[PDB]
A = this chain, B = another copy of it.
Amino acid sequence: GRSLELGAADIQDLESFEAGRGALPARAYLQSDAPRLSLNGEWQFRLSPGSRVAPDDGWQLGEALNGFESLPVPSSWPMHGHGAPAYTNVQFPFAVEPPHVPEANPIGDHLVVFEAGPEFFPHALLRFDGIESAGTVWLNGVELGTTRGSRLAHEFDVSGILEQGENTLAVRVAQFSAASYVEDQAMWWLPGIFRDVTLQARPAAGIDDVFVHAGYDHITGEGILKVEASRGGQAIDAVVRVPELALELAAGTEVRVPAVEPWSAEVPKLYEAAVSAAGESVALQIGFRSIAIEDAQFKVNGRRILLRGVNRHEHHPRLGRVVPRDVVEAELRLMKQHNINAIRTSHYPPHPQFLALADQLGFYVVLECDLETHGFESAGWAQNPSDDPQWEDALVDRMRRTVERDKNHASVVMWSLGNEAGTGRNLAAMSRWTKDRDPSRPIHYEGDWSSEHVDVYSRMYASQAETALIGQGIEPALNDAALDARRRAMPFVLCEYVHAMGNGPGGMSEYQALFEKYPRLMGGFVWEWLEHGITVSTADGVDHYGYGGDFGEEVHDGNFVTDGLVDADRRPRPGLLDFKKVIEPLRIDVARDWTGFTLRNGQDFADTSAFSFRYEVEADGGALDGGTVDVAPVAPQSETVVELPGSVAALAAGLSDGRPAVLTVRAVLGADSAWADAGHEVAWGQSVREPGAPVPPAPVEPVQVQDSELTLGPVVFSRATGMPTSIGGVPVEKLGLTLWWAPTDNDLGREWGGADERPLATQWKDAGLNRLHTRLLGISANPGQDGGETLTVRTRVSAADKQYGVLVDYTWSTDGETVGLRTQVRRDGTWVNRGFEVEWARIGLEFVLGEETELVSWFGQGPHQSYPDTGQGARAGWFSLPLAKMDVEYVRPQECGARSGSRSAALQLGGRTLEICGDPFALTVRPYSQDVLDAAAHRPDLKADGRTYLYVDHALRGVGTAACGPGVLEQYRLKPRDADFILTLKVRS
């Protein structure tokens, strides 16, 4: 018959296998003295739900617009009430049938009016630095072309189309296209023109592209300089000036500079330079460095380097994929302030402005092409575009635009073909193209474990164990002897590791020890830098972050989008505090006798001259001694023993026995830097003079007996339950054993290996650990001292429908001033459920106090939380915080806020102070219960109930990274066992 469907031509274009049409050749992002007009500002915007109902009403001419409204550009339009964000991890949000697109496909018509002065004639262009995902461009009604590659730049020649005076730019943006099948990053799906739109004049005799080659000969100190310049793709005459180095040379020739200060993340030396032609000049920052793989090590400027990296997505909790420049500068400074030295642009090229900042502040950058076909894995990679020859030109284009834009920046030390895109012919073509075009940077790609087309062996979330076998070069061989030989000669990098989702990450230290031990290990990049939380303001409410599912998604992946070291507003999570410590570039081992400290320079190039070394002895009531010690500069990878002043050692020696004292040695910045002010802490070490164990009280007060109550000094017990009802007047609503905590995100992760594939959280629910019950066995008052008496309360703890349990005996003693509490724990029966051993989250006590706590003070590790396999950033000392500040504002509330390694603690309830002491314990204080915490999906769900939930733990479980990667390591797991521990309690005024 004949087709009657609508929009078939618009759809046919969206389903195209090809790159965008009509665009100028890909080139570098260059600072040019050519006239430019940024068209950023308030545009006009119309949204349609699909191509078949996108109007063809001549809107491109900007005349008589109906349905258009104001919208900022650049922008991610769902961040402005036009639709909503949608998060999927691996899942595609549309049926998988490439190259077809769903009928529900938001279409965004953009339009802006602007004026073009005579300086933009006769030749100019329009530059688009990012359009997600498919754009069509008209200028004054004539089509310029289309864009493919959402995070890549497109330029369109407007000569003869741009008219002097007023002009109308019209861009139609479709959210979904065939390109969506290759942009499946675990991300918020956010359409829009989300990066700059610029009008640029192109004068005659100008410069289109530049290719800086700045090598370094580390033997001679020579810099190897060659700056190419082209116009229309052809080499052209141009002069290269580098004033600081007394250099005038022509573009296209290679010279040897006798002496250059090499560039590195530690010392990011940049020489200002200009390459100029008659009609145009462009400014450049040149960093001399050479990259090479040698003896299975990734070496820069002749030395193996250690990558202390993070995975950086581009996200802003209000603007989506638009990251304001001042937030970029801030977050990169925050990285430096936490000893980070490397960045992977997961999983697409960043904003062009990012590259210069990385050059200046100092980061080894893995710049990654915009490619990910993850969602094809669930079907065994059938139809994977990475191996579909029809996608070759589209994927080579993505790699070309990636490389051409940023090829001049010294901070880029690796090109990455993409992420989690399988294996395929098109990936090899992208590698073949990159190796030919820019052989000065090694190629990275984790998705092909055989590593056939790369120069480094990359993996994500490989266990500490496998990492140690790789570091020794004894990993299992590949079937192909030749490929195995190639890969074994490669250095190894973890492009993603220690997944930082929620409470965690655990096991960072074990990775780091391997990084330091095995040169083949290049280091790793944490997943990930930031949480992609989106700010939602509650009706009649405060703000909170929303994640997957909180925006009406039919298909989503929950809070896996919030899996970062900082929150969306760049506030650190405890994991960043620990990370900073783990990757600290210096090691300070303070001598036990306080006579000195061993200092190892862990940096790769710089000495210790930039650091001032300070010490302080702190005690119960403030600092006792402190100052600065001068340290002869220590070479990279060298060690020395630094003497401390005799007054410090003499102080420790003369310290009365049992008095706590902490010696802390810090390496701070001796002077301001581009990323921190002087005195910023870089590394630290400590030696602690522990306090003696608290003497148990003498049991001189006897037990006392009423019909329904018992009294033993300051403690009142309920004769029915045997549990205290008050201590020093503080009401005790409950006291019992704890074996469970509100599951972390990691506990909700499935722990692979072994026949048990339930997450730990599910193992606990099945075992009934969240619903413990206690039965009283007996109460007995026993003879103490000088007529006094101890009180022993025997109980058994278990759960409904379970035969296993634990016998808990509480022995109380008092001298009227302080209470002595001995808890003894003993296993009864075999702790097996559903064929698998039950594991405990902890061995502790929960005190529920009938009054609110305003302040928590303790001596131990702090100020932030610490768990068995975390808390590296928690140092020994005295701390004190308001109850609200003890918590951690994770987006999905979960177990957090424990303070491991506490020797003493003090809770201030109103006018009174409850003091806990005894053998080391973990401390947690909350204004709500564990069941409220576990039930809470968002922070607003946390409601204080006027009580205080005090948790004192004799043993804790680790937190691991089971949400993605290794679970809790063996040494940190907690199997049911017998245990016993003492405490001493006291209430004042």
Contacts and interface: CB of A to CB of B under 8 A. Distances in A.
B779 A5 contact: yes
A97 B4 contact: no
Interface string A785-797: 0000100000010
Interface residues of A, number: 59
Interface stretch (A264-272, A522-530, A656-664, A767-775): A767-775
A796 B5 contact: no
Contacts of A705: 4
Interface in A89-120: 90-97, 100, 102-104
Interface stretch (A141-149, A801-809, A956-964): A801-809
Contact of A93 (B104, B379, B800): B800
Contacts of A720: 5-7, 50, 52-53
A721 interface: yes
B775 A95 contact: yes
A769 to B, nearest CB: 13
24 contacts: A1-B780, A1-B781, A3-B779, A3-B780, A4-B705, A4-B710, A4-B719, A5-B720, A5-B779, A6-B708, A7-B720, A91-B801, A92-B801, A94-B773, A94-B800, A95-B773, A95-B775, A95-B796, A95-B801, A96-B798, A96-B800, A96-B802, A102-B775, A383-B803
Chain B CB within 10 Å, residue with most, of A1, A52, A93, A554: A1
B801 A103 contact: no
A315 to B, nearest CB: 23
A404 to B, nearest CB: 34
Given A6-B708, A6-B720, A7-B720, 19 more contacts: A1-B782, A1-B783, A3-B780, A4-B779, A5-B722, A5-B778, A52-B776, A92-B801, A93-B801, A95-B775, A95-B798, A95-B800, A95-B801, A95-B805, A96-B800, A96-B801, A97-B805, A379-B803, A555-B801
A800 B555 contact: yes
A804 to B, nearest CB: 9
A930 to B, nearest CB: 14
A405 B554 CA distance: 61
Contact of A719 (B6, B92, B781): B6
A378 interface: yes
A20 B705 CA distance: 35
Nearest to A710: B4
Interface in A744-788: 771, 773-776, 778-783
A89 to B, nearest CB: 11
Contacts of A803: 96-97, 379, 382-383
Contacts of A429: none
Contacts of A719: 4-6
B796 A554 contact: no
Chain B CB within 10 Å, residue with most, of A90, A720, A774: A720
Contacts of A100: 775
Contact of A780 (B2, B50, B94, B789): B2
Interface string A702-717: 0101001010000000
A546 interface: no
B801 A375 contact: yes
Contacts of A88: 801
A502 B355 CA distance: 63
A799 interface: yes
Contacts of A6: 708, 719-720
Interface in A872-894: none
Interface in A495-516: none
B774 A103 contact: yes
Interface of A: 1-8, 50, 52-53, 88, 90-97, 100, 102-104, 375, 378-379, 382-383, 554-555, 703, 705, 708, 710, 719-722, 771, 773-776, 778-783, 789, 796, 798-803, 805
A777 to B, nearest CB: 8
Contacts of A798: 95-97
A780 B1 CA distance: 6
A92 B800 CA distance: 6
Chain B CB within 10 Å, residue with most, of A3, A383, A708, A802: A802
Contacts of A799: 95
A111 B327 CA distance: 76
Contacts of A379: 803
A171 to B, nearest CB: 23
Chain B CB within 10 Å, residue with most, of A53, A96, A378, A805: A96
A775 B555 CA distance: 17
Nearest to A832: B379
Give the number of times this chain occurs in the complex, counting copies: 2
B771 A554 contact: yes
Given A102-B775, A771-B554, A802 B4 contact: no
Contact of A771 (B7, B50, B555): B555
Nearest to A797: B95
Nearest to A91: B801
Contacts of A710: 4
A721 B4 CA distance: 11
A562 to B, nearest CB: 21
A1 B555 contact: no
A88 B800 CA distance: 11
Contacts of A779: 3-5
Chain B CB within 10 Å, residue with most, of A104, A703, A801: A801
A176 to B, nearest CB: 11
Nearest to A774: B103
A321 B97 CA distance: 59
A801 B378 contact: yes
Nearest to A771: B554
A136 to B, nearest CB: 20
A745 to B, nearest CB: 22
Contact of A95 (B3, B721, B802): B802
A720 B48 CA distance: 13
Nearest to A50: B720
Contacts of A796: 95, 97
Nearest to A801: B91
A790 to B, nearest CB: 9
Contacts of A708: 6
A94 B720 CA distance: 19
Contacts of A774: 103
Q: Which 7 residue pairs across A and B have the least CB separation, nearest first?
A: A95-B798, A4-B779, A91-B801, A1-B782, A52-B720, A5-B779, A1-B781
Nearest to A781: B1
Contacts of A800: 91-96, 554-555
A756 to B, nearest CB: 14
A102 B773 contact: yes
A776 B796 CA distance: 65
Contacts of A1: 780-783, 789
A798 B100 CA distance: 12
A9 to B, nearest CB: 13
A705 B796 CA distance: 80
A805 to B, nearest CB: 7
A95 B775 CA distance: 9
Contacts of A52: 720-721, 776
Nearest to A52: B720
Contacts of A5: 719-720, 722, 776, 778-779
A36 to B, nearest CB: 42
Contacts of A383: 803
B4 A781 contact: yes
Nearest to A703: B4
A4 B92 contact: no
Contacts of A2: 780-781
A382 B102 CA distance: 58
Contacts of A778: 3, 5, 8
A411 B102 CA distance: 67
Contacts of A776: 5, 52, 103
A555 B779 CA distance: 29
Contacts of A783: 1
A332 B88 CA distance: 57
Nearest to A796: B97
Contacts of A805: 95, 97
Contacts of A92: 800-801
